[PDB]
Ligand binder design. Structure first.
Ligand code: HEC
Length: 104
């Protein structure tokens, strides 16, 4: 749960296509403010693939943990092209940063 170790991973691997702040813009991928507790494909204003819209699960540490390891495996047909984070601790660090930053 290293929130600052988490931030670095974020800058380095996700910042190219996402925003986490309130009212921040949609880049190639959607802004992430408010992820946690919300269903899949729910950022207002972003056009998601039907696969993402329809996944139908709630984002929490556990769904994020499985996803982030292999995004295309979890959301078949996703347009998010990213290989995933192999290491468990890296995924854990990034989730602790996201929980922090995505809820304010
Ligand atoms: C561009 C090359 C991307 C990188 C690098 C990362 N993401 Fe991404 N993400 C991107 C797109 C285009 C999409 C939408 C895909 C679709 O098929 O509609 C996504 C989606 C997400 C989601 C799902 C959000 C939801 O509303 O359910 C999440 C949590 C997400 N992206 C997070 C995320 C993180 C933490 C990343 C860094 C490891 C990351 N993405 C990389 C585009 C791109």
């Amino acid at each position: 749960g290293d929130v600052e170790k988490g931030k670095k991973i974020f800058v380095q691997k996700c910042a190219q296509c996402h925003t986490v702040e309130k009212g921040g813009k949609h880049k190639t991928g959607p802004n992430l403010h408010g992820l946690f507790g919300r269903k899949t494909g729910q950022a207002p204003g972003f056009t998601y693939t039907d696969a993402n819209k329809n996944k139908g699960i709630t984002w929490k540490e556990e769904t994020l943990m499985e996803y982030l390891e292999n995004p295309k495996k979890y959301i078949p047909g996703t347009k998010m092209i990213f290989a995933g984070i192999k290491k468990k601790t890296e995924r854990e660090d990034l989730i602790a940063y996201l929980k922090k930053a995505t809820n304010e």
